[PDB]
């Protein structure tokens, strides 16, 4: 399953396995990793609209973000990714869809979008949570005298 996943989304699997957020891609039967530069949360700005006014029917499938590496660094354009990853290239374009509701992970919560327009941020707990974990309530044999 891990082989199949690393073929699917090599970034996440490499980040989990290596132990740190790292960009990855398969080189056949091996993975090439490269550590990702962390960016402060306060240095990230979301553009309100995911539309592309220059062309009809084409929408950014994932919110645009402007960010700066340092608190005074130049503002750098980019596009949001998964698990708060910022992609330097704004290329994830999809045809625009009616009834377009989306929640995107952003910092500690989500950034709800409607009709390719920013609606509001959401706290992490504002959305019902389902657990893929399986509880193993192993308590400990208490000391007995």
């Amino acid at each position: 399953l891990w082989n199949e996943a690393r073929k699917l989304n090599p970034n996440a699997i490499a980040s989990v396995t290596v132990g740190r957020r790292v960009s990855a891609r398969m080189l056949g039967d091996v993975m090439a990793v490269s550590t990702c530069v962390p960016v402060a949360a306060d240095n990230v700005i979301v553009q309100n609209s995911m539309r592309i006014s220059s062309r009809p029917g084409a929408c950014y499938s994932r919110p645009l973000v402007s960010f700066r590496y340092e608190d005074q660094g130049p503002l750098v354009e980019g596009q949001l990714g998964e698990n708060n990853e910022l992609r330097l290239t704004r290329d994830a374009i999809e045809p625009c869809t009616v009834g377009h509701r989306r929640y995107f992970t952003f910092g500690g919560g989500y950034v709800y979008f409607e009709e390719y327009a920013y609606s509001h941020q959401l706290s992490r707990a504002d959305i019902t949570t389902v657990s893929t974990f399986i509880d193993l309530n192993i308590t400990m044999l208490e000391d007995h005298e």
Epitope: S53, R55, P56, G57, P95, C96, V98, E114, E115, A117
Partner: antibody, heavy 120, light 111 residues
Framework: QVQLQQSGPELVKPGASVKLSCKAS????????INWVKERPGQGLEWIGW????????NYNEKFRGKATLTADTSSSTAYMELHSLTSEDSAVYFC?????????????WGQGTSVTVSS | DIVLTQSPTSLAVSLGQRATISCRAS??????????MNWFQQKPGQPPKLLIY???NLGSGVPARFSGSGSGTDFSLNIHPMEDDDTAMYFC?????????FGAGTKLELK
């Protein structure tokens, strides 16, 4: 349930300027583009531009730089036309349209239309 | 710009049989594997209505007798059977690039 009110017919002197209106109703006016389409019976129906109410941004068909102009009033939930230098041939029907039912962004909601005329 | 041509400028058709028109886009209008071709019918005096979007998807509130096909630059509209409700004016148009245009137009009437 989604309705696009429009102004009535206009009798105008050629070369003047007018203001057509598209009162949107039945949905959040700011969340969908408002397209304007020119309709003269002689020629095929012609798209002149569309305006994004939420941002106020708009793209026009190229030939309609100064002849047409679009504004939007979110408070009134109404997009507006600003026609300028109305030539005799500019006398035509103008449709205001938007998206909302078809899965992709297509002009599937329409107003009753507005027949503008210029004469003497 | 994308220019749209329809082989029948007018097409008289009797009731009940196949009705077919064509639409040419003079170049590709396909993006994301989707042909951004849309078909409109306009009964005279009232605003046009969507019939087919993405060149194959039936517009809502439309009988299945309407049917569309095509990809690349050639697109076609198929109707069967054709009824009095189809005696209208029809437009094929694209939504690929910003100055999106419309077809010259097809007229369907009775022989």
């Amino acid at each position: 349930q989604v309705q696009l009110q429009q102004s009535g017919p206009e009798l105008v002197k050629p070369g003047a300027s007018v203001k057509l209106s598209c009162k949107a109703s039945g949905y959040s006016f700011t969340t969908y583009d408002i397209n304007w389409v020119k309709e003269r019976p002689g020629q095929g129906l012609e798209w002149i531009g569309w305006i994004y109410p939420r941002e106020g941004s708009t793209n026009y068909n190229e030939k309609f730089r100064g002849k047409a102009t679009l504004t939007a009033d979110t408070s009134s939930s109404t997009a507006y036309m600003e026609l300028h230098s109305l030539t005799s041939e500019d006398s035509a029907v103008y449709f205001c349209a938007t998206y909302g039912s078809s899965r992709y962004y297509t002009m599937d909601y329409w107003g009753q239309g507005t027949s503008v005329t210029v004469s003497s | 710009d994308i220019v749209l041509t329809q082989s029948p400028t007018s097409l008289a058709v009797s009731l009940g049989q196949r009705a077919t028109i064509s639409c040419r886009a003079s170049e590709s209008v396909d993006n994301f594997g989707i042909s951004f071709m849309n078909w409109f019918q306009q009964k005279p005096g009232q605003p046009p209505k969507l019939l087919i979007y993405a060149a194959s998807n039936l517009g809502s509130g439309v009988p299945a007798r309407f049917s569309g096909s095509g990809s690349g630059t050639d697109f076609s509209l198929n109707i069967h059977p054709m009824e009095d409700d189809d005696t209208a004016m029809y437009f094929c148009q694209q939504s690929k690039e910003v100055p999106l245009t419309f077809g010259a137009g097809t007229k369907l009437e009775l022989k």
